[PDB]
């Protein structure tokens, strides 16, 4: 009954887990080494790629956890959300955290995960 | 069925409460900002209750809570408030220490909570 | 309708909440005082102990949030995931955070929580 | 001869080290468990108490490092410095850091160390 | 015997304290709102302005504490150090800390303080 | 006839291991035995501190002030045990700080650094 | 670790001091200007209020000093003690003293202090 | 956990209260009607009788309050103390007070109360 | 286990008794023959002298009994309490009493005793 | 000679001594165990009773010593004096003292004595 | 017109400052220099005794008996000194009593009162 | 007209003032250091000594003020008055007061003064 997509066997995680009407996204990153806005867009690119595996879009996203190396970058994320989400927004929270990847120049700055819904 | 988005904040680009079938996803909740840790916890729960009331639900419907602290050693203050307000029926939870995109210190932000609630249709 | 198992009255939390087809785990912790690898196994042990109360196993886990005192320990968790999850992995994210417990010698280094699924 | 005062044999530190015309204060704490403003005042008291051992006052302090659990409390410290330093201020920096002591109710919130000077 | 230069009454600190042959620099900051390289340059500009109050240059700097919002920016600082200190480097340490000022776009990223020497 | 003397200079990092300024000696951050456990990294850091101090004929008895940097500040008691064994009843003023480092944590990661001021009257 | 409750800054006293398992009450007064029975009741009311600050009751009181303008009023207090302490009595002593407050009509006639205990 | 010994239901007091390691003695009185020296010895006899209830002696007494009708009798008390306390004296104070009992021939002249200690 | 400090054999009292974590001060007196403010200051000087025998200060004082020849002198003692106790006040009571020493010119006017606490 | 009236043999006192033109009152008490106002009135009744033995009144009293258990009761006595003395008052002093009687409930609160004159 | 003469009457308090009865004069309690130190208060009380005696043209020389009320009776030597300074080697009989007053003590409080009997023939 | 007998120059008092037909006795004290009955007798002996200076006896005493350190000693004085005054008693009052002399053992416990009359 549980279906597992975009499995990474080296890291031991599944990119997208389908469970009934709900979809659980693994953390999403993209454009790593680039600026904060590119990393946000890059992470949402990965989110969309995984959702396309099951015929879904950002419209099906109901909740997101946003991980920042610097949480004061939230207005940058909000800008991108408003461009990318077509006026339909998920519930969310943002937390500041270190990552197991270097910061500074070309460092990792942003990750995002979430839950999506589509009635079967 | 259809995802329903309640308490939308267009400037922030978030939805206060998302209804997805039998489940309800709460955006971060915050309240009584500028006040002491206990008031801030009560005010965040007040906002949680305000949102759940939009879909006819109460704290009894809450199945999971993520609690965000500037100082995670304030967990016992939260626990005291949980026991008084959740009245013997408690969610699953975890607590995390984090900075906020808001100043700390005098009248700073000290606490946020989000969660998941359930009601079968 | 919502069923609450493994309730801790003193702490005001429920170890496992059943809601329809979904199961919400409280933070899990185990073997504390021990080294990082033991605490990761100890936390998975209490995840499994909680899941067994409703007849579930790590196979039903769809999403986990992993809390590290030192997030650079992710490779330790990935080794243990591969050993215990039998080739079927959840979506996940990892966060670095302080705990309301001492670190250092015999300190707490790791917690995990999550969501499981089982139909009907 | 380097002179060592207010030695703590258990913690393996010296409260005040006199080296030539310079005096090195170990971290100072006081009014522990009380609110941020009291703990700032209590740490300044312990600084004053150590300086008194060598006939000196806050007038002799040239540099202070201030350690906060929450660095956004700087304004609180500034208020207290202005009413206690009598227009004669040290060079300083402030750092936000965890302590090997609990935070929360009756937690540690503040430490200060520093360097004082008196020409012999 | 203590001379205090560049006193900031609102902040209750002294920019540069002269104590015998030693000079203690308050945290230095500059070009705020700009990128990490520019903020490192601006902080060094302020250190130099302060040292010029007493006829000194970066040559007299013996020790520096460097505060970063993201400590992985150390190689950016090292590049600037090699450019400006021409072959004469102080002892130092680097610390990652929060500041009592916002991060994100146009936020504070860097401060430096130090100790200088000139034999009278 | 230069007044400030700089010893153990690291050209790539742009720092001086030990700066002598009159009667005072400033130690750059000290690090040792990296990839090993907290106790070993603490001993390694203090071995570097001793090494640098030996360049000017000094000993830990000359150390007046020490800043201790921990990835996990709750390791202070580990350091305190090592201090009591290596400083022999003569201790500096100190403070301890928790900080991230520009080097990985976790297995074989960096856990500890120390710096300080030493003194010797001329 | 001493805690001070119900502090009076103007008179320079603490209403209730907690030290380990012991609680020391400042002198208690109440219903001033009323007759001797009321002032005894008002004093016990204040003792009860102070004890309530730490979740304690009259049951935790181990010792009381009773201060009378007229010590022949002891039987009035004994009737009140029996009414309020329900079979569990402190050790006590009574003293006749003048007060720094007028006697006569609407005068001060009675104060009480004491020690309470609650094992942690 | 409080124990109450030698209770007087009529007067509403407890002769000796046990509170952890500490023991609180009600006012002690004896040989009434007799001369000052006998009343002082009678009071100490009653203190000793009360202490005997919990296996203690005057050696356990840490503090005494001595109540005199005529405080100039202190040297009569000091002699008795030197004779009975065997080189181990408590901290004390002495107070002149009236008593709710007649003075004069066969009057009440002295009471003493106090605190005793014994580590369990 | 009980320790007795500053013993006066002539008087049969102990200046300070240590009993577990508690310390009991004998009555304290100083600057005798001087005016009321000096004698209060002298008494507090004797309290600090005795507490120093065990490495304590007025911060350890939890309770004080104040004995006045004229209890209307309470405002004078309160002034001195505020000057000397640095915002951390004991519980207390005040009683008017005769002393076994002459009043009048150069007479005794004030004594204080009390209880202090320090956790071992 | 000295004349002695209202003699109490057991207490060894004379209630009123006549000595030439002067009259010395023993301590006066009454309304035993009542409130301060009644006890002050009771002592004045006793003063009057003794003075009437020689045909005198409160108008003849030249000096009074007033004994209080609580001297802050002076204002209560002043009120009674204004009620009892018809606009002509003695010289007086007041002192606080214990009495050889219990205080408290139904205790003794007040005594007065004095000197009177009649030519 | 009454045989007993009543001088310096205080209607609010219900007392007569000085009562003349035949050859004898009865002084109400005397108080003065209130709020001052014991010596001034004693001098102030005697001043007040003198003020009342002057109403009938008498002086301290006529005083035959005085009762002295002290808040602290060990101040008697302070009073004896003033008696010697002011009474010209002719002293009344006296007694001294310690008592509270219906007035506050402490700073600026009331410390001393005196009353008395004087004599003047015809 | 006024005659002054038994003058004490150092104390500034007159033992016996004769004014017209009246005799004013200074306070009388005797048998100091003796028990209460003896001091009462000693005070009456002194009264007689002074009265004998003008050929008078206790028969001439019209009024006495009796001063006690303990007013409950009235019955002791009453017994001695019945013996010594033999059926011819004065008007009197008794007061309790402190004396400017030590109490206690061999202290002062009783004084008496009075008024006597003899028609010329």
Write out chain D in H/E/C secondary structure. Answer: CCEEEEEECCCCEEEEEEECCEEEEEEECCCCCCCHHHHHHHHHHHHHHHHHCCCCCHHHEEEEEEEECCHHHHHHHHHHHHHHCCCCCCEEEEEECCCCCCCCCCCCCEEEEEEEECCC
User: Which tokens sit at K59?
Assistant: 């002086």
Please give the Cα distance from I92 to I108 (Å, whole number).
21
Helix (H) or strand (E) holding J80: helix J74-84
| Residue in chain H lying closest to J100 (CA) | H102
Using DSSP, state whether C9 is helix, strand or coil.
coil
- Number of residues in chain D: 120
H and D make contact (3+ CB pairs below 8 Å): no
J114 alpha-carbon distance from chain centroid = 6
Torsion on CA atoms B112, B116, B117, B119, rounded to nearest 10: 160
Please give the Cα distance from I99 to G117 (Å, whole number).
32
Report how far apart, in Å, the C-alpha atoms of L99 and of each of J36, J94, L29 are.
28, 18, 11
Torsion on CA atoms K32, K37, K38, K40, rounded to nearest 10: -50
Q: Exposed, middle or buried: residue J11 (CB in 10 Å: 0-12, 13-18, 19+)?
A: middle
Instruction: Give domain limits for chain K.
Output: 2-122
Q: Confirm if D34 and D76 have CB atoms less than 8 A apart.
A: no
Please give the Cα distance from K106 to K104 (Å, whole number).
7
User: What are the backbone dihedrals phi and psi of residue E14, each rounded to the nearest 5 degrees, phi first?
Assistant: -110, 130
F2-122: which CATH architecture?
A: 2-Layer Sandwich (3.30)
Using DSSP, state whether I85 is helix, strand or coil.
coil
Residue with tokens 């200051």: I41
Task: Classify the phi-psi angles of B32: left when phi > 0, otherwise alpha if psi is within -120 to 50, otherwise beta.
Answer: left
DSSP string, A55-66: T--GGGEEEEEE
Nearest chain D CA: its distance from B73 CA (Å): 4
User: Which tokens sit at C95?
Assistant: 């966060």
**Residue (of B23, B89, B85) closest to C4 by Cα position:** B89
Residue with tokens 């006193």: E7
| β-pair partners for E61 | E116
Q: Confirm if F94 and F67 have CB atoms less than 8 A apart.
A: yes
Q: Confirm if C7 and C18 have CB atoms less than 8 A apart.
A: no
**Residue (of B43, B25, B24) closest to B33 by Cα position:** B43
User: What single DSSP character describes residue J103?
Assistant: -
The data reach a resolution, in angstroms, of: 2.2
H21–I24 CB contact, under 8 Å = no
* E57 Cβ contact list (under 8 Å, min separation 6): E48, E51
Alpha helices in chain C (DSSP H): 36-52, 74-84
Write down the CATH number for the domain with range L1-120.
3.30.1330.40
Residues of H whose CB is below 8 A from G63: 17, 24, 115
Q: Exposed, middle or buried: residue E95 (CB in 10 Å: 0-12, 13-18, 19+)?
A: buried
| Residue in chain F lying closest to A101 (CA) | F104
Q: Confirm if H40 and H76 have CB atoms less than 8 A apart.
A: yes
J22–K21 CB contact, under 8 Å = yes
Q: Confirm if I5 and I84 have CB atoms less than 8 A apart.
A: no
Residues of E whose CB is below 8 A from B105: 100
Residue with tokens 């020849």: I69
User: Which tokens sit at F1?
Assistant: 């006839």
| β-pair partners for J98 | none
| Residue in chain C lying closest to F107 (CA) | C73
Please give the Cα distance from B21 to A60 (Å, whole number).
12
User: Which tokens sit at D6?
Assistant: 């207010």
Please give the Cα distance from C11 to A28 (Å, whole number).
33
Indicate the pairing of strand A110-117 with strand A91-96.
unpaired
H98–J102 CB contact, under 8 Å = no
Please give the Cα distance from K82 to K39 (Å, whole number).
8
Please give the Cα distance from B39 to B110 (Å, whole number).
10
User: Which tokens sit at D82?
Assistant: 């202005």
Using DSSP, state whether E13 is helix, strand or coil.
strand
E91–F9 CB contact, under 8 Å = no
B106–D69 CB contact, under 8 Å = no
G59, G93, G97: residue with CB nearest H111: G93
Please give the Cα distance from L16 to L4 (Å, whole number).
6
Q: Confirm if D25 and D115 have CB atoms less than 8 A apart.
A: yes
Mutate to test the interface with H, among L105, L106, L107, L108 (most CBs of H within 10 A): L105
Please give the Cα distance from B120 to B24 (Å, whole number).
11
Q: Confirm if G44 and G11 have CB atoms less than 8 A apart.
A: no
Residues of J whose CB is below 8 A from G109: none
F23, F93, F97: residue with CB nearest D95: F97
Please give the Cα distance from F60 to F66 (Å, whole number).
11
User: Which tokens sit at F13?
Assistant: 């990092």
Q: Confirm if H117 and H60 have CB atoms less than 8 A apart.
A: yes
H36 alpha-carbon distance from chain centroid = 14
Please give the Cα distance from F67 to F76 (Å, whole number).
12
| β-pair partners for D19 | D22
* H115 Cβ contact list (under 8 Å, min separation 6): G63, H22, H23, H24, H25, H61, H62, H63, I24
Catalogue the E-assigned strands of E9-119: 13-19, 22-28, 61-68, 91-96, 110-117
* A24 Cβ contact list (under 8 Å, min separation 6): A16, A17, A115, C62, C63, C90, C91, C115
Using DSSP, state whether L3 is helix, strand or coil.
strand
Please give the Cα distance from A59 to A90 (Å, whole number).
9
Nearest chain J CA: its distance from H46 CA (Å): 26
G20–I117 CB contact, under 8 Å = yes
Indicate the pairing of strand G91-96 with strand G61-68.
parallel
Residues of K whose CB is below 8 A from G100: 104, 106
User: What are the backbone dihedrals phi and psi of residue K9, each rounded to the nearest 5 degrees, phi first?
Assistant: -75, 135
Indicate the pairing of strand J3-8 with strand I110-117.
unpaired
Q: Confirm if H8 and H76 have CB atoms less than 8 A apart.
A: no
Cα dihedral sign for E99, E101, E104, E110? negative
Q: Confirm if F69 and F97 have CB atoms less than 8 A apart.
A: yes
User: Which tokens sit at L94?
Assistant: 């008794």
C117–A26 CB contact, under 8 Å = no
Report how far apart, in Å, the C-alpha atoms of I49 and of each of I46, I87, K44, K84 are.
5, 20, 42, 44
Indicate the pairing of strand E91-96 with strand D110-117.
unpaired
J and G make contact (3+ CB pairs below 8 Å): yes
K84–L20 CB contact, under 8 Å = no
Q: Confirm if K64 and L23 have CB atoms less than 8 A apart.
A: no
Catalogue the E-assigned strands of A20-90: 22-28, 61-68
A76, A104, A105: residue with CB nearest E104: A76
Using DSSP, state whether H77 is helix, strand or coil.
helix
Radius of gyration of chain D from its Cα atoms, rounded to whole angstroms: 14
Number of DSSP helices (H) and strands (E) in chain H, helices first: 2, 6
Nearest chain C CA: its distance from D35 CA (Å): 19
User: Which tokens sit at K36?
Assistant: 């001052």
Helix (H) or strand (E) holding I22: strand I22-28
Radius of gyration of chain K from its Cα atoms, rounded to whole angstroms: 14
Could you count the other beta carbons within 10 Å of the beta carbon of residue L4? Answer: 19
B72, B76, B104: residue with CB nearest D70: B104
Q: Confirm if L70 and L31 have CB atoms less than 8 A apart.
A: no
- Number of residues in chain H: 120
Residues of H whose CB is below 8 A from I16: 91
K106–G100 CB contact, under 8 Å = yes
| Residue in chain B lying closest to C11 (CA) | B79
Q: Exposed, middle or buried: residue E76 (CB in 10 Å: 0-12, 13-18, 19+)?
A: buried
From first CA to last CA, the distance across chain D in angstroms is 14
User: What are the backbone dihedrals phi and psi of residue K47, each rounded to the nearest 5 degrees, phi first?
Assistant: -55, -40
| Residue in chain G lying closest to I92 (CA) | G26
Residue with tokens 């106090």: H114
User: What single DSSP character describes residue B99?
Assistant: -
| Residue in chain G lying closest to J101 (CA) | G72
Could you count the other beta carbons within 10 Å of the beta carbon of residue H75? Answer: 12
Report how far apart, in Å, the C-alpha atoms of I10 and of each of G46, H58, I17, I43, J84 are.
42, 19, 17, 20, 59
User: Which tokens sit at G15?
Assistant: 């209403």
Helix (H) or strand (E) holding J42: helix J36-52
Please give the Cα distance from B80 to B77 (Å, whole number).
5
Q: Exposed, middle or buried: residue D30 (CB in 10 Å: 0-12, 13-18, 19+)?
A: buried
Using DSSP, state whether E33 is helix, strand or coil.
coil
Which fold is adopted by the domain B1-121?
60s Ribosomal Protein L30; Chain: A; (3.30.1330)
Using DSSP, state whether L15 is helix, strand or coil.
strand
Please give the Cα distance from I58 to I86 (Å, whole number).
9
User: Which tokens sit at C9?
Assistant: 């009255």
Task: Classify the phi-psi angles of J84: left when phi > 0, otherwise alpha if psi is within -120 to 50, otherwise beta.
Answer: alpha
Mutate to test the interface with E, among F1, F3, F4 (most CBs of E within 10 A): F4
Write down the CATH number for the domain with range J1-119.
3.30.1330.40
| β-pair partners for I11 | none
Q: Confirm if C107 and F79 have CB atoms less than 8 A apart.
A: no
Please give the Cα distance from K18 to K53 (Å, whole number).
8
Residues of I whose CB is below 8 A from H118: 1
Residues of J whose CB is below 8 A from G110: none
**Residue (of J98, I88, A41) closest to D42 by Cα position:** I88
Structure-solving method: X-ray
Residue with tokens 């220099």: K33
F106–C69 CB contact, under 8 Å = no
Partners for E (CB, 8 Å, 3+ pairs)? A, B, D, F
| β-pair partners for J10 | none
Catalogue the E-assigned strands of chain H: 3-8, 13-19, 22-28, 61-68, 91-96, 110-117
Please give the Cα distance from A15 to B33 (Å, whole number).
37
Please give the Cα distance from H48 to L60 (Å, whole number).
55
Q: Confirm if L28 and L50 have CB atoms less than 8 A apart.
A: yes
* Rounded (10°) angle between helices H36-52 and H74-84: 40
Torsion on CA atoms G28, G32, G38, G43, rounded to nearest 10: -10
* L52 Cβ contact list (under 8 Å, min separation 6): none
Using DSSP, state whether C15 is helix, strand or coil.
strand
Task: Classify the phi-psi angles of D104: left when phi > 0, otherwise alpha if psi is within -120 to 50, otherwise beta.
Answer: left
DSSP string, chain G: --EEEEEETTTTEEEEEEETTEEEEEEE--STTS-HHHHHHHHHHHHHHHHHTTT--GGGEEEEEEEESSGGGHHHHHHHHHHHSTT---EEEEEE---SS--STT---EEEEEEEE---
Q: Between chain H and chain J, how many beta carbons pairs sit less than 8 Å apart?
A: 6
Q: Confirm if A116 and B48 have CB atoms less than 8 A apart.
A: no
Burial F19-47 (b: 16+ CB within 10 A, else e): bbbbebbbbbbbbbbbeeebbbbbbbbbe
Cα dihedral sign for G75, G79, G85, G89? positive
Mapping DSSP onto H, E and C, the string for F46-76 reads: HHHHHHHHHCCCCCHHHEEEEEEEECCHHHH
Percentages of chain B per state (helix, strand, coil), in multiples of 5: 30, 35, 35
**Residue (of L45, L72, L93) closest to K67 by Cα position:** L93
Please give the Cα distance from E111 to E30 (Å, whole number).
8
User: Which tokens sit at D77?
Assistant: 């410290």
Please give the Cα distance from G33 to G109 (Å, whole number).
8
Please give the Cα distance from E56 to E62 (Å, whole number).
12
Catalogue the E-assigned strands of chain L: 3-8, 13-19, 22-28, 61-68, 91-96, 110-117
C100–D100 CB contact, under 8 Å = no
Q: Exposed, middle or buried: residue G7 (CB in 10 Å: 0-12, 13-18, 19+)?
A: middle
Cα dihedral sign for D37, D38, D39, D42? positive
Nearest chain G CA: its distance from I62 CA (Å): 6
Please give the Cα distance from E44 to E58 (Å, whole number).
9
**Residue (of H112, H116, H115, H50) closest to H81 by Cα position:** H112
Could you count the other beta carbons within 10 Å of the beta carbon of residue E22? Answer: 22
Torsion on CA atoms K67, K71, K73, K75, rounded to nearest 10: -100
Q: Confirm if F89 and D12 have CB atoms less than 8 A apart.
A: no
Taking every pair of Cα atoms in chain B, the longest distance, rounded to a whole number of angstroms, is 45
Residues of B whose CB is below 8 A from D74: 105
H29 alpha-carbon distance from chain centroid = 7
**Residue (of C69, C76, C78) closest to C96 by Cα position:** C69
* L89 Cβ contact list (under 8 Å, min separation 6): J4, J7, J8, J12, J13, J14, L81
Report how far apart, in Å, the C-alpha atoms of C50 and of each of B23, B81, C77 are.
22, 25, 19
DSSP string, K46-66: HHHHHHHHHTTT--GGGEEEE
Partners for D (CB, 8 Å, 3+ pairs)? B, C, E, F
């Amino acid at each position: 009954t549980i279906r597992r997509y975009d499995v990474n066997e080296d890291r031991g995680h599944t990119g997208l887990v389908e469970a009934g009407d709900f979809y659980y996204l693994n953390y999403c990153v993209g454009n790593v080494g680039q600026d904060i806005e590119s990393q946000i867009n890059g992470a949402f690119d990965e989110m969309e790629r995984r959702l396309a595996l099951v015929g879904l879009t950002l419209d099906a996203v109901v909740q997101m956890d946003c991980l920042f190396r610097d949480v004061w970058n939230i207005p940058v994320m909000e800008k991108m959300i408003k461009e990318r989400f077509n006026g339909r927004y998920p519930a969310r929270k943002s937390i500041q955290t270190e990552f197991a990847h270097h910061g500074g120049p070309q460092g990792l700055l942003f990750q995002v995960d979430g839950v999506a819904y589509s009635k079967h």
